[PDB]
Amino acid sequence: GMFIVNTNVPRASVPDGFLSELTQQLAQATGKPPQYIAVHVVPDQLMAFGGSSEPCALCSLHSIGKIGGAQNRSYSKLLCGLLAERLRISPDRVYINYYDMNAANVGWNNSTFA
Amino acid sequence: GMFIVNTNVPRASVPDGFLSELTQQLAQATGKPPQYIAVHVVPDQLMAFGGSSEPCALCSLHSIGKIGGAQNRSYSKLLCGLLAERLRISPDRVYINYYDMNAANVGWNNSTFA
Amino acid sequence: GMFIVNTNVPRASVPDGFLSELTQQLAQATGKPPQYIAVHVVPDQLMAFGGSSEPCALCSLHSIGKIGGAQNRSYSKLLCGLLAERLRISPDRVYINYYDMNAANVGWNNSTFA
């Protein structure tokens, strides 16, 4: 699983341990070992959501499987919850793109997962 | 709609208001209310296009629908036009990836659009 | 072809010429003229792979065609090889997403490739 977060929130506002919490919560949520989970936080971005510069986030979750209608719906609750509580970003100023990656299309350790 | 721009152009060369102009032009171009449009500009990047370090840009437009052969062709005119005029990037040093997102795959405000 | 690399490795650790080597190796590997190859390196990122902050990388290769089971497998060898040798990132701390882009979905120079 790979979670990326781009946000206008300053680096200083990213709580220590945020990456750890995301790895842990996403591991539970997807049912994958934490060791397979990679997380990326990109703060201080030049962004606008709806033409406003208020705190917002553009994210994406890539996963070989574990992506689907109902699952994505609960990932959004989990993720928006985390972003709201930890980064103080309003849930309606967050977009999360979900990608069900094919194993043959995910390279890792000199090969792919196919 | 979500528009991202990665470019080697310095932050100082990004005109104030560029994010607003993008929001407005993309809203018109896609026929979506400006409030649904999110824009992201990432300057000062370590990039190379064709092996050259001259100003270039790697972009992506994600949209639930409003993506297609003809539409994408005019988006490129609009976007390359804006990048050329506002960031002085030559149109032939710009790649834009278009993504027709499924509503069930776009999370927002604790749920998805499905 | 478009190759992006996000890594926690410091900017100072990115060897001069790395972008050039990537452009050249990817050109050979995909069988495309170097002029069509765009490369992007994003260092100093706040990342975690498996909950660890040791050097890691999250990458993606987008290409109109030239994407497939066997090809992706050798791209991973090539790419992990380069990342390991030039950025000292362990191959098992690298994820590379492969995207076979439809020509109608790749904008360039005021139009698309369709």
- B50 and B66 in contact (C-beta within 8 Å)? no
Cα distance between residue B91 and residue C108, in whole Å: 7
Which amino acid appears at position A97 of this protein?
N
Strand arrangement of the beta sheet that strand B46-49 belongs to: A111-112, A106-108, C94-100, C57-63, C2-7, C38-42, B46-49
* Phi, psi values for residue A38, rounded to 5°: -120, 140
Cα distance between residue A49 and residue A95, in whole Å: 9
What does the block give as tokens for A103? 């194993």
Closest CA relative to residue C14, chosen from C36, C53, C37, C45: C45
The CATH number assigned to the domain holding C66 equals 3.30.429.10
- C108: left (phi > 0), else alpha (psi -120 to 50), else beta? beta
Q: Which positions in chain B touch C20 (Cβ < 8 Å)? A: 48, 51
Resolution of this PDB entry, in A? 2.5
Which amino acid appears at position B97 of this protein?
N
Cα distance between residue C106 and residue C114, in whole Å: 8
Half-sphere exposure of C103 (CA within 13 A, CB side): 4
H and E: helices and strands count for chain B: 2, 7
Q: Which long-range contacts link A19-22 to residues 24+ away (Cβ below 8 Å)?
A: A19/C46, A19/C47, A19/C48, A19/C53, A20/C48, A20/C51, A21/A82, A21/A86, A22/A82
User: Judging by beta carbons within 10 Å of its beta carbon (0-12, 13-18, 19+), is residue B34 exposed, middle or buried?
Assistant: middle
- C8 and C55 in contact (C-beta within 8 Å)? yes
Calculate the CA dihedral of residues A82, B60, C61, A113 and round it to 10 degrees: 40
Domain count, chain C: 1
Partner residues linked to C92 by β-bridges: none
Q: How far is CA B91 from the centre of its chain?
A: 13
- B110 and A76 in contact (C-beta within 8 Å)? yes
Q: Does A37 touch chain C (CB under 8 A)?
A: yes
Cα distance between residue B2 and residue A42, in whole Å: 17
The string over C20-35, giving b where at least 16 C-beta atoms fall within 10 Å of a residue's C-beta and e elsewhere, is eebbebbbebbebebe
SS (H, E, C) chain C: CEEEEEECCCHHHCCCCHHHHHHHHHHHHHCCCHHHCEEEEECCCEEEECCECCCCEEEEEEECCCCCHHHHHHHHHHHHHHHHHHHCCCHHHEEEEEEECCHHHEEECCEECC
* Phi, psi values for residue B3, rounded to 5°: -115, 125
Partner residues linked to A4 by β-bridges: A40, A60
Secondary element (H or E) of residue B102: none
What does the block give as tokens for B33? 């209310």
Partner residues linked to C94 by β-bridges: C57
The string over C51-89, giving b where at least 16 C-beta atoms fall within 10 Å of a residue's C-beta and e elsewhere, is beeebbbbbbbbbbebbeeebbeebbbbbbebbbebbeb
Residue of A nearest to B32 (CA): A50
3-state secondary structure of B18: helix
Chains contacting C with at least 3 CB pairs below 8 Å? Answer: A, B
Task: Mutate one of C62, C97, C101 to test the A interface: name it (highest A CB count within 10 A).
Answer: C97
Which amino acid appears at position C55 of this protein?
P
Q: Does B70 touch chain C (CB under 8 A)?
A: no
Instruction: Note whether B97 contacts C107, CB cutoff 8 Å.
Output: yes
What does the block give as tokens for B105? 């795959």
Torsion sign, CA atoms C8, C13, C16, C21: negative
- A29 and C45 in contact (C-beta within 8 Å)? no
Cα distance between residue B90 and residue B112, in whole Å: 37
- C36 and C1 in contact (C-beta within 8 Å)? yes
Residue span of the structural domain in which A42 resides: 1-114
Q: Does C103 touch chain B (CB under 8 A)?
A: no
Instruction: Note whether C72 contacts A19, CB cutoff 8 Å.
Output: no
Half-sphere exposure of B38 (CA within 13 A, CB side): 24
- The experimental technique behind this entry is X-ray
The neighbour count for residue B10, using CB atoms within 10 Å, is 11
The neighbour count for residue A27, using CB atoms within 10 Å, is 18
